[PDB]
Design an enzyme around this catalytic site. Structure first.
Site, PDB file in Angstrom:
ATOM      1  N   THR A   1      40.464  34.784  30.786  1.00  0.00           N
ATOM      2  CA  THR A   1      40.896  35.586  31.959  1.00  0.00           C
ATOM      3  C   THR A   1      41.386  34.551  32.624  1.00  0.00           C
ATOM      4  OG1 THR A   1      38.861  35.447  33.337  1.00  0.00           O
ATOM      5  CG2 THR A   1      39.085  37.220  31.800  1.00  0.00           C
TER       6      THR A   1
ATOM      7  N   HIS B   1      33.485  41.491  26.127  1.00  0.00           N
ATOM      8  CA  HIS B   1      34.532  42.336  25.809  1.00  0.00           C
ATOM      9  C   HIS B   1      34.603  43.450  24.858  1.00  0.00           C
ATOM     10  CE1 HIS B   1      36.494  38.957  28.419  1.00  0.00           C
ATOM     11  NE2 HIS B   1      35.367  38.285  27.649  1.00  0.00           N
TER      12      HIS B   1
ATOM     13  N   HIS C   1      30.075  36.848  25.036  1.00  0.00           N
ATOM     14  CA  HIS C   1      30.344  35.451  25.505  1.00  0.00           C
ATOM     15  C   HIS C   1      29.111  34.822  26.385  1.00  0.00           C
ATOM     16  CE1 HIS C   1      35.178  36.058  25.069  1.00  0.00           C
ATOM     17  NE2 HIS C   1      34.298  35.750  23.973  1.00  0.00           N
TER      18      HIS C   1
ATOM     19  N   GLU D   1      38.134  39.423  21.233  1.00  0.00           N
ATOM     20  CA  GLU D   1      39.188  38.542  21.600  1.00  0.00           C
ATOM     21  C   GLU D   1      39.762  37.764  20.741  1.00  0.00           C
ATOM     22  OE1 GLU D   1      37.844  37.103  25.823  1.00  0.00           O
ATOM     23  OE2 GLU D   1      39.454  38.796  26.238  1.00  0.00           O
TER      24      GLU D   1
ATOM     25  N   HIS E   1      36.097  43.550  35.852  1.00  0.00           N
ATOM     26  CA  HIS E   1      36.792  43.079  34.441  1.00  0.00           C
ATOM     27  C   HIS E   1      35.818  43.261  33.489  1.00  0.00           C
ATOM     28  CE1 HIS E   1      39.817  41.619  37.215  1.00  0.00           C
ATOM     29  NE2 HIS E   1      38.806  40.799  37.937  1.00  0.00           N
TER      30      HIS E   1
HETATM   31  N1  LIG Z   1      29.539  29.274  40.236  1.00  0.00           N
HETATM   32  C1  LIG Z   1      30.273  30.242  39.658  1.00  0.00           C
HETATM   33  C2  LIG Z   1      31.340  31.072  39.653  1.00  0.00           C
HETATM   34  C3  LIG Z   1      32.098  31.635  40.486  1.00  0.00           C
HETATM   35  C4  LIG Z   1      33.292  32.391  39.977  1.00  0.00           C
HETATM   36  C5  LIG Z   1      33.608  32.790  38.587  1.00  0.00           C
HETATM   37  C6  LIG Z   1      32.509  31.958  37.787  1.00  0.00           C
HETATM   38  N2  LIG Z   1      32.774  32.447  36.219  1.00  0.00           N
HETATM   39  C7  LIG Z   1      34.088  32.691  35.637  1.00  0.00           C
HETATM   40  C8  LIG Z   1      33.700  32.704  34.567  1.00  0.00           C
HETATM   41  C9  LIG Z   1      34.675  33.117  33.224  1.00  0.00           C
HETATM   42  C10 LIG Z   1      35.742  33.483  33.369  1.00  0.00           C
HETATM   43  C11 LIG Z   1      36.230  33.766  31.826  1.00  0.00           C
HETATM   44  C12 LIG Z   1      35.404  33.634  30.764  1.00  0.00           C
HETATM   45  S1  LIG Z   1      35.607  33.817  29.196  1.00  0.00           S
HETATM   46  N3  LIG Z   1      36.043  35.147  28.631  1.00  0.00           N
HETATM   47  O1  LIG Z   1      34.207  33.335  28.796  1.00  0.00           O
HETATM   48  O2  LIG Z   1      36.489  32.826  28.833  1.00  0.00           O
HETATM   49  S2  LIG Z   1      33.782  32.810  31.767  1.00  0.00           S
HETATM   50  N4  LIG Z   1      32.412  32.284  34.223  1.00  0.00           N
HETATM   51  N5  LIG Z   1      31.917  32.147  35.603  1.00  0.00           N
HETATM   52  C13 LIG Z   1      31.496  31.404  37.972  1.00  0.00           C
HETATM   53 ZN   LIG Z   2      34.882  36.515  28.055  1.00  0.00          ZN
END
Ligand SMILES: N#Cc1cccc(-n2cc(-c3ccc(S(N)(=O)=O)s3)nn2)c1
Ligand SMILES: [Zn+2]
Length: 257
Positions: free
Chosen positions: A196, A93, A116, A103, A61
């Site tokens: 996401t 992104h 981010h 975004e 992604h």
């Molecule tokens: N520990 C851990 C762990 C395991 C799986 C996924 C994640 N993890 C997911 C995410 C994020 C998903 C969307 C964003 S966003 N685009 O900043 O809103 S940050 N950031 N860290 C963290």
């Molecule tokens: Zn992000």
């Protein structure tokens, strides 16, 4: 699964993730004339002197530069936040062309990309717990425009050819995220969500007013990444952004006038 194409992109996410139509989704358009200056907002504290980067990962992604968050080495405090938020990873992104990619938007303006820096609230103990809380995360968002090169980004650009495809990672130690910041820490803030899936409504968004400049050559190398895994048909990793979502019952606050 979910992604960014015609058949699995943002307009489809709601079928698996009904919170996609929720009350506090991100990103949003920041209408600068209607954002209100808030004197209650304390100054932001970005304390990244002890940051310990570990690894860079293409997750299909975006790419993530991950940090050691087993102790308070790189943290965000102050501004709209109470408590201490620990840096876990940053990512970007971006677009297929320089007129799109971010975004968040500013008076409907799209930037070429958006950084981010993702942080979690240490009173919840771990990231997976923090995401189940309305104040669990704080994401520092920074726009990129195309112009002069950003010297502090070049180490990231130069490792991308080693993580071309989904699931590839590389050692990425001793990287200094302070090199990605603009001079000013003036910001807008609002409550929102992960942009996401699983689109959890756990984020205090802190979006910096001042963009950073990156070169056309830098952004171009982001666009040579792949959504696909190794030995699969090539799908360029571009346009991995979610569009602006309804503001609904929220007011965006500004740290500046
Ligand atoms: N520990 C851990 C762990 C395991 C799986 C996924 C994640 N993890 C997911 C995410 C994020 C998903 C969307 C964003 S966003 N685009 O900043 O809103 S940050 N950031 N860290 C963290
Ligand atoms: Zn992000």
């Amino acid at each position: 699964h979910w992604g960014y194409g015609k058949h699995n992109g943002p307009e489809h996410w709601h079928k698996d993730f009904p919170i996609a139509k929720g009350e506090r989704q991100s990103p949003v358009d920041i209408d600068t004339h209607t954002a209100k200056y808030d004197p209650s907002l304390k100054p932001l504290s970005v304390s990244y002197d002890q940051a310990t980067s570990l690894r860079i990962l293409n997750n299909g992604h975006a790419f993530n530069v991950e940090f050691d968050d087993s102790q308070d080495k790189a943290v965000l405090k102050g501004g709209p936040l109470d408590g201490t938020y620990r840096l876990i990873q940053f990512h970007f992104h971006w677009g297929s062309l320089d007129g799109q990619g971010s975004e968040h938007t500013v008076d409907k303006k799209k930037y070429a990309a958006e950084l981010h820096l993702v942080h979690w609230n240490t009173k919840y103990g771990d990231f997976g717990k923090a995401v189940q809380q309305p104040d669990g995360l704080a994401v520092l968002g920074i726009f990129l425009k195309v112009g002069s090169a950003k010297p502090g980004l070049q180490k990231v650009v130069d490792v991308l050819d080693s993580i071309k495809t989904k699931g590839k990672s590389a050692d990425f130690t001793n990287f200094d995220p302070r090199g990605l910041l603009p001079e000013s820490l003036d910001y807008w803030t609002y409550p929102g969500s992960l942009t996401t899936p699983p689109l959890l409504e756990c984020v205090t968004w802190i979006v910096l007013k001042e963009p950073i400049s990156v070169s056309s050559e830098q952004v171009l190398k982001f666009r040579k990444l792949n959504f696909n895994g190794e030995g699969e048909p090539e799908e360029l990793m571009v346009d991995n952004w979610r569009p602006a979502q309804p503001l609904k019952n929220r007011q965006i606050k500004a740290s500046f006038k």
